[PDB]
Design a protein around this ligand. Structure first.
Ligand SMILES: *[C@H](C)[C@H]1/C(=C/c2[nH]c(/C=C3N=C(/C=C4\NC(=O)C(CC)=C4C)C(C)=C\3CCC(=O)O)c(CCC(=O)O)c2C)NC(=O)[C@@H]1C
Ligand SMILES: CCC1=C(C)/C(=C/C2=NC(=C\c3[nH]c(/C=C4\NC(=O)[C@H](C)[C@H]4CC)c(C)c3CCC(=O)O)/C(CCC(=O)O)=C2C)NC1=O
Ligand SMILES: CCC1=C(C)/C(=C/C2=NC(=C\c3[nH]c(/C=C4\NC(=O)[C@H](C)[C@H]4CC)c(C)c3CCC(=O)O)/C(CCC(=O)O)=C2C)NC1=O
Ligand SMILES: CCC1=C(C)/C(=C/C2=NC(=C\c3[nH]c(/C=C4\NC(=O)[C@H](C)[C@H]4CC)c(C)c3CCC(=O)O)/C(CCC(=O)O)=C2C)NC1=O
Ligand SMILES: CCC1=C(C)/C(=C/C2=NC(=C\c3[nH]c(/C=C4\NC(=O)[C@H](C)[C@H]4CC)c(C)c3CCC(=O)O)/C(CCC(=O)O)=C2C)NC1=O
Ligand SMILES: CCC1=C(C)/C(=C/C2=NC(=C\c3[nH]c(/C=C4\NC(=O)[C@H](C)[C@H]4CC)c(C)c3CCC(=O)O)/C(CCC(=O)O)=C2C)NC1=O
Ligand SMILES: CCC1=C(C)/C(=C/C2=NC(=C\c3[nH]c(/C=C4\NC(=O)[C@H](C)[C@H]4CC)c(C)c3CCC(=O)O)/C(CCC(=O)O)=C2C)NC1=O
Ligand SMILES: CCC1=C(C)/C(=C/C2=NC(=C\c3[nH]c(/C=C4\NC(=O)[C@H](C)[C@H]4CC)c(C)c3CCC(=O)O)/C(CCC(=O)O)=C2C)NC1=O
Ligand SMILES: CCC1=C(C)/C(=C/C2=NC(=C\c3[nH]c(/C=C4\NC(=O)[C@H](C)[C@H]4CC)c(C)c3CCC(=O)O)/C(CCC(=O)O)=C2C)NC1=O
Ligand SMILES: CCC1=C(C)/C(=C/C2=NC(=C\c3[nH]c(/C=C4\NC(=O)[C@H](C)[C@H]4CC)c(C)c3CCC(=O)O)/C(CCC(=O)O)=C2C)NC1=O
Ligand SMILES: CCC1=C(C)/C(=C/C2=NC(=C\c3[nH]c(/C=C4\NC(=O)[C@H](C)[C@H]4CC)c(C)c3CCC(=O)O)/C(CCC(=O)O)=C2C)NC1=O
Ligand SMILES: CCC1=C(C)/C(=C/C2=NC(=C\c3[nH]c(/C=C4\NC(=O)[C@H](C)[C@H]4CC)c(C)c3CCC(=O)O)/C(CCC(=O)O)=C2C)NC1=O
Lengths: 138, 162, 57, 172, 162, 172, 162, 162, 173, 162
């Protein structure tokens, strides 16, 4: 509800095909080992082949997936998770330490699911990657 | 990790709201069944040593080649039979763990997570372990509603095997 | 990815943006559910494409 | 996220033995006292919004420079900031009493709390004067018997107040 | 919409897995409270007309200026008092709706969603409606565990008001 | 997502009246018949993987060109494709018996499934020959008179089989 | 924070380009407007003490029950009346702040941000503060174009209240 | 699908640039070996019927229980042995397909994609098929560099099995 | 964070919680009066913005000539275009600072984490501030010079235009 | 950086799989091409000093105003002619670098990356450098397939210029 507190941004340097795309989405978020056998979801794979669900929409499911929450959300601290969340979708470590902290309080109020939805909504994120393109390092 | 008390929390936490009566109602349901679930834990813990060697010699019956073929994976060597009672004895631990937790969480996190990756690499056929668990669910001697209770989680490990 | 099944199909005509990298194909449908439909129509209009039809599903 | 049921599994996994019978007699008392635990939880959440402002009638009246010009609770967004997360203490303390173990609370609510509270500039010690004022009002509601069958929930009252004392220790 | 049977579904659907015993635990638990929750629905439906006019004349007591000040928003003339029993009578509907659903869902979707937006625009102070609901929770005449049941959802509407 | 409890609310909201006493006597039978639903539901999910391959062999043994070279179940990911969503029928039919109303079934298996099955080129009618073979095995397990206690599950069995018939009608 | 000089910057910064002649025009507008806006600041600062006690006794007129009803929230005893002149005296500060800034920024960041959250919790009805601000905009004695200048920001706080 | 001519395209297409000399060089490499790869295709196509029945009776040697145990999964009666020469005969097709394509693409898309899913459900142990492929790579009678080439893809199917 | 001359004299006045004094409003009245000059200064800098950067690059590289010689960090072509892609970003934010009239928008972008990247990359940090001074020698030469314009003292603007370049050189060196 | 051996790696690394026979084939192609590419490197290195002063006096022919107009960018005095043989002598280095690498990588990373940014700022017209490179590709005296080899990378720098 309330507008985000203004945080300073540190200067940064950064500032078969179908099957591969699914793997790429999985790879950035799960770092290879996590996909395993259990983490993979049949419905998400079907939607992409089906194309009913957009890639931007596809990632949200992975971000909000139960397997992801147990592995990262539960174990890690809220502040760490905000920093942790940034690498996989944004692809960039947060420039300002204070900014990361500001994000964490918001994450707690809306939950893990709430924070992920917010990242997609932000103008910088959509513009940087695009709906069609899988998230990549910046 | 997955528990009906945990599942009430993680549902209400991602919404950012308090504990409603719908999360609270779920907890109430767990208690009625947790009284009969702890009955199933003592039935498996007391009969633990009978059930392990009851199982690891039942799998040798249906698969007699597993004690004969010379392979690292095979249990024909004593070292395999030492790792036989370790592996099947690991199953009754996690089944008893998921009994007292009420959920499939400890079964989901300790046993079946990444089981398709490991059985392909070491060539352990999952038809072996499902034959031991059918022996456990028929020979635990449990009765009543507690006999239903162990029978879900054993059969839940069966479906995750295949 | 919508808490409930309330999905409305959207058809945009001509999307102007960086046209090779950002929008490689215009005149395509976007399948957004009920919760973000407030947000989605503001996203389309920022590029400048105009909506043809909005069909539920 | 851990429990009373799951934490007595997790150390029992680390030693790798079957669960003993006196651990199951321990958990049988946890089920037995479960109904009492539920009742306490519902009274806190139903009086959840009434606690926070009644704590804010004393959190700001006792240290009155905080809302006076200059203090960090002065302007209106800043004032709504220490009601947007005064309740998050209650949002996670009620999660701790539900789970029955403070491991849920430690991971999110207090893990990074004492670091932001010197990065922002807010008085960290001026939080734990009023979280104690929440505990004085929380155990007053949870113990009072109104339209309820007589029962003894004293053990919960002391370790309900232990969750507030853990909530005040890692901020101060 | 939020229901303990629904909350078991939407948790298991986002995970892409079947219904485990942890989703299925809640349903068993829910029926036991749903037996006492439907007791609370008949207690409010039968005493419905006593409770509405018991409430809309109790709010006139604590706020006597609401019948005196000439405003579209205030209940000065008969048109406000006609919209008085409509609004307070809308509350006992949704409270009885969330009783039989078992969750706060119908209360969350019909009543309190966007209530801060509407009360700011029409200048309806939310201190009025919380005074009527305190009259309802003390004068429904319900007893036993069913008296606890209506008392949560009334108090849940109180906290969402303030 | 609707229910038996929530759908008798939703039409009652559209007419805007209080819930009648004979609707509450109807729901009181639903709570009374509630325990039976769980027992039926747990037996299906525990034999969930055993149904699909047993249902599956008949599905391919009766129409044997499908896995023979040329059919749409021929190659190996194509074969794993009609086991990855043979179970999704069981994933949502079990959601329908849990909710007690088919309104959660018709958004996932019945909504756009007949549209993909034409564009895809996979036969649509060759699905509903084997979903009937699932129903022949599902009600055989749910109605088996083994364990628990003898009771009347006939009402549930007939409208358990009604969910499979709705699952076969919108594909064929 | 929101200022026509700031709004020229944040528009040109997100594009990554220099200051064009279009960014400059917004800044140019402020000087002519800002000459008449500082006229409105001295008109409110010099008449500050007349306007506060002129306002906090005007709200007691239209709402006589606010001095009679005993509650922490109401201004029954002297402690409420001490917090009366604090709160209404806070409004004339931020109105004079947003006058010399030229934008609604200090009004947007100090006063109205999260005002719906605070008035719901402490049960302060926003119909009270809008009655004081109507007294200020009619009794500041300002004339000319400067009388228009204070009249926007007062009315901007009115719309954010309701 | 994966081919050295395709891999030059999909690398240069995702960059949005033309075909450089670095994509061009890769294409030439595929063409040069491709002269020895088509030697390996005729060596397997001409000896196809000897190699299939040479393989499906070699797996019966090391696993004699597969012709004895009554189960659909097993090759006890003639229907399993009919599906024996189908399955092993499917392998020599895709091996010959990936020979003339030069890449592992047809092997990656027809055979090994989702092989862990299917072998768990039908309980087909992957130790059976790896025993047939070791018979093929030792008994194809191929010589020279074509013997080396034929083996890679057989051994690539071996590693994907385990 | 983005602050001003108008907004910073609000922000400390909020922290003390008093009304704005009359001598602060007489201070801001001079800012409005001196405001017209500020717009003109920015206009001449931005119109000669591209002419400054290469004329600074005619000395930034001629004075330290190993930098573009093989081995230096301005050697290859992308690298060379890298120290023209952000030589102008100094001018992009210094002109934002003169427009706002306060360096609080300058210190979040060029001064915040710039000295950290400039040892992470391997670029000489001190070899930037030799040429940002060469920008200031050309910036105040253009801003100061008057052609077809009414003449008024611009010393306050110029002395503290050069203070923004000195802050831009201090946090890099 | 872009190399056919590198392009096999970065393709197989982003898939997370091993080196297949398709990744390997690209490397094999380079050796046959790389045997004729190193022939082209010695042909340009031995004739290096003839080719530079052959080029920088050929551009003075077609553009005689470049030695006459007084400007910093223009090669009017000796300073420009000193920077003439530096710049054109930089081109034959990177052309010989991309010869022995087999790919366009060193050409892509040292020379043409950001070339449109630099030629706009210093007003160096790219029609000058393309006139020197046409002199190099016609006067290197190379023959056979090696004459094709230098002719691609010279012409690849031509297209990136315009
Ligand atoms: C200052 C470092 C140098 C300088 C400036 C200077 N300016 C003026 C007068 C004017 N400058 C402007 C500029 C603008 N007016 C606008 O509306 C805009 C768009 C935002 C601009 C850019 C104008 C219009 C005036 C006055 C009116 C007019 O010119 O028509 C003066 C003299 C007049 C005055 O005091 O305003 C001076 C001196 N002169 C120098 O020598 C300095 C180096
Ligand atoms: C808005 C604040 C901000 C700055 C300043 C910034 C700088 C920045 N400079 C970079 C590189 C670079 N910067 C230079 C700069 C120089 N070489 C010299 O000789 C000179 C002394 C100097 C310039 C005056 C060079 C050569 C590189 C490329 C280095 C390499 O790739 O090895 C990079 C990595 C590549 C890229 O541009 O994306 C970043 C992110 N980023 C920011 O967000
Ligand atoms: C805590 C839960 C848990 C279990 C149960 C588990 C089992 C497990 N058993 C393994 C191997 C093995 N498993 C067995 C067991 C058997 N093979 C036979 O021949 C018999 C039929 C059968 C026993 C009845 C044997 C003999 C090995 C060694 C095989 C090899 O080394 O290739 C391996 C791979 C190698 C290892 O670390 O030892 C795992 C991961 N791991 C776990 O984390
Ligand atoms: C590889 C498959 C592919 C293609 C082909 C493609 C083309 C393409 N050309 C576009 C625009 C455009 N394309 C043209 C082309 C022309 N107009 C004329 O009058 C000429 C005759 C003609 C060139 C010879 C123009 C003028 C635009 C801009 C239209 C506009 O701005 O409204 C756009 C969208 C606008 C943009 O971002 O620039 C696309 C997607 N995108 C793809 O992904
Ligand atoms: C889930 C557990 C959790 C908690 C509790 C938490 C607190 C927390 N409070 C914060 C700020 C704040 N905290 C307060 C609270 C106070 N300041 C005062 O003046 C009062 C004395 C006191 C309240 C009684 C205020 C007013 C801010 C905003 C300060 C600022 O923006 O600089 C911040 C940094 C900015 C933010 O995102 O909003 C965090 C991370 N974060 C967490 O993740
Ligand atoms: C999740 C929804 C839910 C709630 C809220 C719930 C509460 C609940 N509390 C109960 C009992 C009780 N609850 C209390 C609680 C207390 N007595 C005191 O004097 C103390 C101050 C206080 C504890 C601090 C007591 C003493 C009993 C007596 C019966 C028992 O031991 O359960 C019972 C027993 C059965 C019944 O009352 O019909 C219920 C239902 N049950 C539910 O299904
Ligand atoms: C289904 C659940 C539901 C409820 C309860 C509800 C209430 C509701 N009451 C309203 C107005 C109103 N509400 C009241 C009621 C009162 N004002 C008084 O003076 C008395 C103190 C009090 C009654 C006891 C009155 C008189 C109005 C008209 C006020 C106006 O027109 O400004 C309005 C705004 C205008 C409208 O459409 O009529 C809503 C949305 N809306 C809903 O959707
Ligand atoms: C009779 C034996 C048989 C079966 C079983 C069969 C199923 C089948 N389902 C397919 C596709 C599919 N099936 C689904 C189904 C779903 N995805 C979801 O996320 C939903 C929850 C669910 C519907 C409720 C989807 C989304 C596709 C995508 C491809 C298509 O449109 O066909 C395809 C396309 C070809 C392939 O996968 O190789 C096959 C083969 N084909 C056969 O020959
Ligand atoms: C063959 C036809 C048939 C069926 C289907 C049948 C079911 C059945 N399940 C029952 C009980 C029950 N069934 C369950 C089952 C569960 N509760 C949960 O919360 C779990 C998730 C789930 C197990 C996984 C429970 C808890 C009871 C309580 C009563 C008892 O112990 O039998 C009873 C007891 C008598 C009655 O309900 O009238 C019946 C009839 N009886 C029959 O004659
Ligand atoms: C800097 C901008 C700013 C303002 C204006 C502000 C107002 C503000 N006034 C408050 C209470 C109050 N506000 C009033 C004022 C009034 N009540 C009445 O009866 C009269 C009608 C009216 C005055 C005309 C009173 C009496 C209280 C105390 C109420 C209570 O304690 O419950 C409160 C909650 C408790 C507090 O800290 O004192 C806030 C946050 N806060 C801010 O940060
Ligand atoms: C084109 C690539 C391709 C292959 C290779 C393939 C194999 C394959 N073999 C199968 C069954 C089978 N596979 C075998 C083969 C064997 N079982 C034994 O006992 C022997 C050890 C072994 C042969 C050496 C048998 C007997 C069946 C039938 C088992 C059953 O019906 O349960 C099945 C499941 C049912 C079917 O459609 O027939 C598949 C999908 N599918 C493919 O798409
Ligand atoms: C390693 C690959 C590489 C090349 C080739 C390269 C060229 C290059 N030549 C430059 C300037 C120059 N380039 C030339 C060359 C010419 N001007 C003329 O008049 C003649 C027509 C022509 C030569 C035939 C001259 C004279 C300058 C100096 C111009 C100036 O200082 O403004 C500059 C800008 C200033 C510099 O650092 O010296 C670059 C970056 N840089 C690179 O990194």
């Amino acid at each position: 509800s309330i507008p985000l507190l203004e945080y300073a941004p540190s200067s940064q340097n950064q500032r078969a095909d179908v099957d591969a795309i699914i793997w790429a989405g999985y790879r950035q978020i799960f770092s290879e080992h996590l996909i395993i056998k259990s983490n993979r979801q049949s419905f998400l794979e079907s939607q992409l082949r089906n194309r009913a669900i957009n890639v931007r929409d596809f990632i949200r499911g992975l971000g909000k997936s139960e397997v992801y929450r147990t592995q990262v959300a539960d174990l890690n601290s809220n502040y760490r998770l905000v920093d942790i969340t940034l690498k996989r979708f944004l692809g960039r470590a947060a420039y300002n330490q204070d900014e990361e902290i500001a994000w964490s309080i918001v994450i707690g109020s809306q939950g893990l699911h709430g924070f992920i939805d917010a990242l997609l909504d932000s103008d910088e994120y959509r513009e940087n990657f695009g709906d069609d393109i899988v998230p990549y390092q910046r | 990790v997955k528990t009906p008390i945990t599942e009430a929390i993680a549902a209400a936490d991602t919404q950012g709201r308090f504990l409603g009566n719908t999360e609270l109602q779920s907890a109430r349901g767990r208690y009625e069944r947790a009284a009969a679930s702890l009955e199933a834990a003592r039935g498996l813990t007391s009969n633990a040593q009978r059930l392990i060697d009851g199982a690891t010699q039942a799998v040798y019956q249906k698969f007699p080649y597993t004690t004969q073929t010379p392979g690292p994976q095979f249990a024909a060597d004593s070292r395999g039979k030492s790792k036989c009672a370790r592996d099947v004895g690991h199953y009754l631990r996690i089944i008893t763990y998921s009994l007292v937790a009420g959920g499939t969480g400890p079964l989901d996190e300790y046993l079946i997570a990444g089981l398709a990756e490991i059985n392909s690499t070491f060539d352990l056929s999952p038809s072996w372990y499902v034959e031991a668990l059918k022996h456990i669910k028929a020979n635990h001697g449990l009765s009543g509603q507690a006999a239903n209770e162990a029978n879900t989680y054993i059969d839940y490990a069966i479906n995750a095997l295949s | 990815v919508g808490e409930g099944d309330r999905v409305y199909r959207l058809e945009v005509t001509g999307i102007r943006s960086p046209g090779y990298p950002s929008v490689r194909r215009s005149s395509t449908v976007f399948i957004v559910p009920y919760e973000r439909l407030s947000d989605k129509i503001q996203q389309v209009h920022k590029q400048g494409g105009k909506i043809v039809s909005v069909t539920s599903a | 996220t851990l429990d009373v049921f799951t934490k007595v599994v997790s150390q029992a996994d680390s030693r790798g033995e079957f669960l003993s019978n006196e651990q199951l007699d321990a958990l049988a008392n946890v089920v037995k006292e479960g109904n009492k635990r539920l009742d306490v939880v519902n009274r806190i959440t139903s009086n959840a919004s009434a606690i926070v402002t009644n704590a804010a009638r004393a959190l700001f009246e006792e240290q009155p420079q905080l809302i006076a010009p200059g203090g960090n609770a002065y302007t209106n967004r800043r004032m709504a900031a220490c009601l947007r997360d005064m309740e998050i203490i209650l949002r996670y303390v009620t999660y701790a009493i539900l789970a029955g173990d403070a491991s849920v609370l430690d991971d999110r609510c207090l893990n990074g709390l004492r670091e932001t509270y010197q990065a922002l500039g807010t008085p960290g010690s001026s939080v734990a004067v009023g979280v104690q004022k929440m505990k004085d009002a929380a155990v007053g509601i949870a113990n009072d018997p109104n339209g309820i069958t007589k029962g003894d929930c004293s053990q919960l009252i002391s370790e309900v107040a232990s969750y507030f004392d853990r909530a005040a220790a890692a901020v101060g």
